[PDB]
Design a protein around this nucleic acid. Structure first.
Lengths: 120, 120
RNA sequence: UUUGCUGCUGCUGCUGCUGCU
RNA sequence: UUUGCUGCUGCUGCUGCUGCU
């Protein structure tokens, strides 16, 4: 078991749940991922566009959680790191080498927030 | 001559200029691009981290300029659109289908600004 | 604008490398 | 953390398509 950058578990909806959601309604949430070298950790999280929910999903990873997970993969040569998020058909990615990871985190967290607060 | 999304011309430094810059000093600027289907338009722009300069480079494209350039490429099937920017070893990308382009623009402009205002 | 996955398409991004500039 | 380009590497992102879920 590798250690993930994430502090919340995955919330991927089942196929049945997704169909039921489509018949009765606005996505159920958003997808995000962190990639270090060749390893990618992924989350689907429920998000309902309220403030409480935004605050919850914003705690799904931190500088520290990403750094502890990422450093597992560090070597002589710098590795590529990447955060990806998709909400409503819009994807943001923030990437660079492992030496920039603090800065990637900084931009990822703003991006996640800008995207999730974006009006339809 | 295709029509570009950009309102400023490219400012790529020569190899000699770049060497001279490296011997005497902090990058000379940043790189950005807009991709519609298979066509990508690219800029290198000088940016010195002042407010006046930030304002100048922020005018290098607009919603309208991106839309007029992009619509050249629209068909039956939605196309993939993407804005990419790299400054100080950190790359942001904003992508999606052509139906989301207004929203991509909205997130691209914020991203460009967050990244260029980021402290080293 | 959509749950998760398979295989294909075209175009980016990032990492490392290469040769010129 | 770096001007622009050539060719290679590995991993994403996006578009369209596919078969299951």
């Amino acid at each position: 078991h590798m250690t993930s950058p994430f502090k919340l578990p995955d919330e991927s909806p089942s196929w049945t749940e997704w169909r039921l959601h489509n018949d009765e309604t606005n996505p159920l949430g958003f997808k995000e991922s962190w990639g270090f070298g060749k390893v990618v950790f992924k989350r689907y999280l429920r998000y309902d566009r309220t403030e409480a929910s935004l605050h919850r999903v914003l705690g799904s990873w931190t500088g520290d959680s990403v750094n502890y997970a990422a450093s597992r993969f560090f070597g002589f040569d710098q590795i590529g790191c990447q955060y990806s998020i998709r909400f409503r058909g819009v994807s943001i990615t923030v990437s660079g080498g492992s030496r920039t990871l603090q800065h990637l985190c900084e931009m990822a967290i703003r991006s996640k927030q800008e995207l999730l607060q974006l009006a339809p």
